[PDB]
Amino acid sequence: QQNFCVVELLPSDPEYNTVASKFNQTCSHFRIEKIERIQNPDLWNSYQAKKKTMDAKNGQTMNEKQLFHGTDAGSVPHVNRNGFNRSYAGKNAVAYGKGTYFAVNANYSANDTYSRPDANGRKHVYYVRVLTGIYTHGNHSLIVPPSKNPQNPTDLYDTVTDNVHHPSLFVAFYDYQAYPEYLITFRK
Numbered sequence: 001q002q003n004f005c006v007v008e009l010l011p012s013d014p015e016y017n018t019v020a021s022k023f024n025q026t027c028s029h030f031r032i033e034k035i036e037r038i039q040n041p042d043l044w045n046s047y048q049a050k051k052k053t054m055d056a057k058n059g060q061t062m063n064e065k066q067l068f069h070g071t072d073a074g075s076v077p078h079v080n081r082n083g084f085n086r087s088y089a090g091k092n093a094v095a096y097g098k099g100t101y102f103a104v105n106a107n108y109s110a111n112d113t114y115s116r117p118d119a120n121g122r123k124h125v126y127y128v129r130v131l132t133g134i135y136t137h138g139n140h141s142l143i144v145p146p147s148k149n150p151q152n153p154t155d156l157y158d159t160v161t162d163n164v165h166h167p168s169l170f171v172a173f174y175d176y177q178a179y180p181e182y183l184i185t186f187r188k
């Protein structure tokens with residue numbers, strides 16, 4: 001279930017200049033070793049279904065952003081199979097899951113705290129399609145999606161950010177809200 005393939009994106013492939021250019025806006029001091037495309041049909045189809053629903057509701061809003069997420073090597077196969085979906089006890093009592101964080105700029109995700117260097121010094125950051133939708137600033141203490149309207153408090157925001165008009169990060173909460181399209185492997 002949610003089987004996947006991994007294909008190297010070569011420097012000569014159409015999308016390389018764009019993916020590398022975005023990473024290099026803030027990470028040009030690192031050296032890129034490989035960029036790969038993650039091809040997971042079930043995960044892609046489910047993400048696209050969520051995108052279609054959001055596009056049909058949010059008017060002019062550009063619901064998708066491409067953001068970064070650094071992780072340790074041991075999490076890579078999990079992300080490739082499951083994306084950023086989470087399962088745990090009591091998830092189904094409430095309308096959302098535990099937040100998953102993404103950065104606007106690659107250098108944030110390139111921190112060793114996130115993209116932990118592996119045994120060979122290799123660091124791993126995904127360039128992820130994320131349905132940011134309609135967002136507000138995150139709660140300071142209760143890390144859940146806030147209500148949009150005190151008169152309708154089960155209607156929740158799609159994501160939260162640190163700063164509504166100058167974001168540096170986004171937090172996603174819902175299933176199939178993100179697709180791990182590209183994996184960038186790099187070194188100091």
Ligand SMILES: Cc1nc2sc3c(c2c(=O)[nH]1)CCC3
Nearest residue numbers: 069070101102103109114169
């Ligand atoms: C595992 C992981 N956690 C976090 S928290 C956070 C980011 C980030 C990441 O890239 N990976 C980037 C923005 C704030």
